[PDB]
Amino acid sequence: AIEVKLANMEAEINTLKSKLELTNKLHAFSMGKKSGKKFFVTNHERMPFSKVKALCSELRGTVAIPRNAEENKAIQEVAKTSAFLGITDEVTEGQFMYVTGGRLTYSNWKKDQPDDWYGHGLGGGEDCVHIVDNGLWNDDSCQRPYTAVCEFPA
Amino acid sequence: AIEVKLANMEAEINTLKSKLELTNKLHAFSMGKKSGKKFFVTNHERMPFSKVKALCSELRGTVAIPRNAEENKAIQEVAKTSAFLGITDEVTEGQFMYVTGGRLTYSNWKKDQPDDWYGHGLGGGEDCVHIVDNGLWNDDSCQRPYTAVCEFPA
Amino acid sequence: AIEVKLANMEAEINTLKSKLELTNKLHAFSMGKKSGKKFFVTNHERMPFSKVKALCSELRGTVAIPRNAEENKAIQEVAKTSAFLGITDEVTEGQFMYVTGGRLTYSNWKKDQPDDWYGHGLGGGEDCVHIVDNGLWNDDSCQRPYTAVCEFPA
Ligand SMILES: CC(=O)N[C@@H]1[C@@H](O)[C@@H](O)[C@@H](CO)O[C@H]1O
Ligand SMILES: CC(=O)N[C@@H]1[C@@H](O)[C@@H](O)[C@@H](CO)O[C@H]1O
Ligand SMILES: CC(=O)N[C@@H]1[C@@H](O)[C@@H](O)[C@@H](CO)O[C@H]1O
Ligand SMILES: CC(=O)N[C@@H]1[C@@H](O)[C@@H](O)[C@@H](CO)O[C@H]1O
Ligand SMILES: [Ca+2]
Ligand SMILES: [Ca+2]
Ligand SMILES: [Ca+2]
Ligand SMILES: [Ca+2]
Ligand SMILES: [Ca+2]
Numbered sequence: 001a002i003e004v005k006l007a008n009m010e011a012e013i014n015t016l017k018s019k020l021e022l023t024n025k026l027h028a029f030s031m032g033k034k035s036g037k038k039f040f041v042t043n044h045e046r047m048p049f050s051k052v053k054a055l056c057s058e059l060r061g062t063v064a065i066p067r068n069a070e071e072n073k074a075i076q077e078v079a080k081t082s083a084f085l086g087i088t089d090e091v092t093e094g095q096f097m098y099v100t101g102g103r104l105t106y107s108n109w110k111k112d113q114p115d116d117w118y119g120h121g122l123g124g125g126e127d128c129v130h131i132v133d134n135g136l137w138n139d140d141s142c143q144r145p146y147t148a149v150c151e152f153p154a
Numbered sequence: 155a156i157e158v159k160l161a162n163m164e165a166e167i168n169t170l171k172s173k174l175e176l177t178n179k180l181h182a183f184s185m186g187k188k189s190g191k192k193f194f195v196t197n198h199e200r201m202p203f204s205k206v207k208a209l210c211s212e213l214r215g216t217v218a219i220p221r222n223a224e225e226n227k228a229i230q231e232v233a234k235t236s237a238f239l240g241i242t243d244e245v246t247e248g249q250f251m252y253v254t255g256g257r258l259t260y261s262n263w264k265k266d267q268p269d270d271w272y273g274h275g276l277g278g279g280e281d282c283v284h285i286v287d288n289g290l291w292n293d294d295s296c297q298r299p300y301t302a303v304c305e306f307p308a
Numbered sequence: 309a310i311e312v313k314l315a316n317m318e319a320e321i322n323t324l325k326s327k328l329e330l331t332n333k334l335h336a337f338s339m340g341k342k343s344g345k346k347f348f349v350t351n352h353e354r355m356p357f358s359k360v361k362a363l364c365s366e367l368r369g370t371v372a373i374p375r376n377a378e379e380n381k382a383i384q385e386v387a388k389t390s391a392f393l394g395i396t397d398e399v400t401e402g403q404f405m406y407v408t409g410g411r412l413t414y415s416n417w418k419k420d421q422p423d424d425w426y427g428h429g430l431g432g433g434e435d436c437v438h439i440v441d442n443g444l445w446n447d448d449s450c451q452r453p454y455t456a457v458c459e460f461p462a
C-alpha cells in the first residue's frame with residue numbers, strides 16, 4: 001500500500017533529521033562550543049573583509065562580533081591572530097554598526113583608534129574593524145586581509 | 155507517476171543515509187578516533203558532574219571511563235586539564251561503580267585517595283572521581299566543576 | 309492528499325540535502341580547509357601503507373599527495389610527525405608514481421634518498437614514501453607504520 005510506504009518514509013526522514021541534528025551538536029561540542037554560549041570558529045585563512053562576509057554567509061553564520069569582554073576574549077583565542085570583527089562604519093563615517101544591524105553596544109579600541117587613516121595608500125580611509133593579539137581593536141582598510149572568524153548562535 | 159516518484163525518494167533517502175554515515179565517519183576521524191577503538195571528546199568546559207552526565211547523554215555518549223592505563227592516558231591528553239570520570243560511589247559509599255553499572259576493573263588512585271572528604275565545605279563528602287596530576291585519580295564533590303569529556307564506542 | 313504528501317516529502321528531502329551540505333562545509337572549514345584549496349586531515353594514528361590507503365578510501369579521499377612546496381608544508385603541519393604520502397614505486401621499481409595515477413613530478417627527497425634499502429629486515433626493499441618532520445622525503449617499507457593523513461578535493 002502506497003500510503004503505508006509513504007508513512008514509513010516520513011518516519012525514515014524524521015530519523016535522519018534527528019541524526020543530522022546530533023551530528024551538528026557533537027561537531028559544535030568538539031569545536032569548543034560552551035553550553036548556552038555563542039560558537040566561534042576559523043579555518044585560519046586571512047582575507048579581505050568582503051571575502052569573510054561572503055564566507056561566513058556561505059556557512060549560514062556571520063562575521064564574529066563580541067558583545068562584551070568575554071566574547072571578545074573567546075574570539076581572540078579562536079583566531080589566535082588578527083581577525084576582522086562584524087563591525088564597520090562604511091555607511092556613515094564615524095558611526096560604527098554591526099553587519100547584522102545596530103549601533104555599538106560595546107567596544108574596546110586602542111588608545112589612538114579609530115583614526116580612519118588615509119595614509120595606508122590602499123586608497124580611501126579605514127571603515128573596517130579588526131582585533132589585534134592583545135584584544136584591542138583598530139579600524140583598518142576593508143581591502144586588507146585578516147583572519148576569518150565566523151560566529152553561530154548559542 | 156506516483157509510484158515512480160515514491161521509488162525515487164526511497165533511493166534519495168538511502169543515498170542521504172549513506173552520506174550522513176560518511177560524514178560521521180570523517181568527523182570521528184578528525185576528532186582523533188583510532189581504528190576499532192573508543193574515542194574521547196571534550197569542549198573544554200568545566201561543569202558539575204550532573205551537567206557532564208546530562209551533556210554526554212544528549213550527545214548519545216557516556217561520561218569518559220578509563221578501562222586501562224592506555225585509555226586513562228588518552229582521556230588525559232584530550233582533557234589536558236582535570237576531568238570527571240564516569241565513576242562514582244553515590245549508590246553505596248565506599249563502593250565505586252561505573253555510571254554504566256558494575257564494579258571497577260582498573261583504577262589509578264592517588265595515594266591517600268579516595269577519602270570522602272567533608273572539609274571542602276560544599277556539603278556531603280566526595281562521591282565523584284576526576285583525574286589530577288600524573289593521571290592519578292581523586293574522589294571529589296560531584297558539585298565541583300571539572301572538564302566534561304564524553305566517550306563514544308569503538 | 310497522496311500527491312500533497314509526496315510533494316512535502318520532496319521538500320523535506322531537499323532541505324535535508326541542503327543542511328547536510330552546510331554541515332560538510334562547516335566541518336571542512338573547522339578542519340582548516342582554505343578557499344579553493346584541497347585539505348588534509350589526520351586522526352594521528354600510525355599504520356602500514358595499505359591500511360592508510362583503505363582508510364582514506366573509505367572516507368572518500370586519498371592518501372595525502374604534495375604537488376608543490378606549499379602543500380608539502382600543509383601536510384607536515386597537519387601530520388606533525390612522519391606520515392605516508394600517496395606516492396610509491398610498487399608498480400615499477402625506481403619509477404615513482406601517484407597512487408591516483410601518473411609519474412612523480414614535484415619531489416622533495418632527503419639527501420641520498422630514495423635508495424630502495426633492504427637492510428631494514430622487514431623483507432623486500434622500500435617502495436613507499438613518507439614525509440619526515442622537516443618536510444623532506446624518504447622511501448621506506450610499505451610495512452612500516454606511519455601517520456595516516458588523507459586529502460580531500462579543493
Ligand atoms: C594594524 C594597525 O594598528 N594599523 C594602524 C592603521 O590603521 C592606522 O591607524 C595607523 C595610523 O596612521 O596606525 C596603524 O598602527
Ligand atoms: C579502516 C578504519 O578503521 N576505518 C574507520 C572508519 O570506518 C570510521 O569508523 C572512522 C571514524 O572516524 O575511523 C576509521 O578508523
Ligand atoms: C584535588 C584534590 O586532590 N583534592 C583533595 C580533596 O579531595 C581531599 O582528598 C583533600 C584531603 O585533605 O586532599 C585534596 O588534595
Ligand atoms: C626514516 C629513514 O630515513 N629511514 C632511512 C631508510 O629508509 C634507509 O634509507 C636507511 C639507509 O641506511 O637510512 C634511513 O635513514
Ligand atoms: Ca569611510
Ligand atoms: Ca571610517
Ligand atoms: Ca586605524
Ligand atoms: Ca535526484
Ligand atoms: Ca564517597
Ligand SMILES: [Ca+2]
Nearest residue numbers: 269280293294
Ligand atoms: Ca578526595
Ligand SMILES: [Ca+2]
Nearest residue numbers: 316317319320
Ligand atoms: Ca515539515
Ligand SMILES: [Ca+2]
Nearest residue numbers: 397424434435
Ligand atoms: Ca623501491
Ligand SMILES: [Ca+2]
Nearest residue numbers: 423434447448
Ligand atoms: Ca630509504
Ligand SMILES: [Cl-]
Nearest residue numbers: 126127141142
Ligand atoms: Cl575601508
Ligand SMILES: [Cl-]
Nearest residue numbers: 280281295296
Ligand atoms: Cl559528592
Ligand SMILES: [Cl-]
Nearest residue numbers: 434435449450
Ligand atoms: Cl615496500
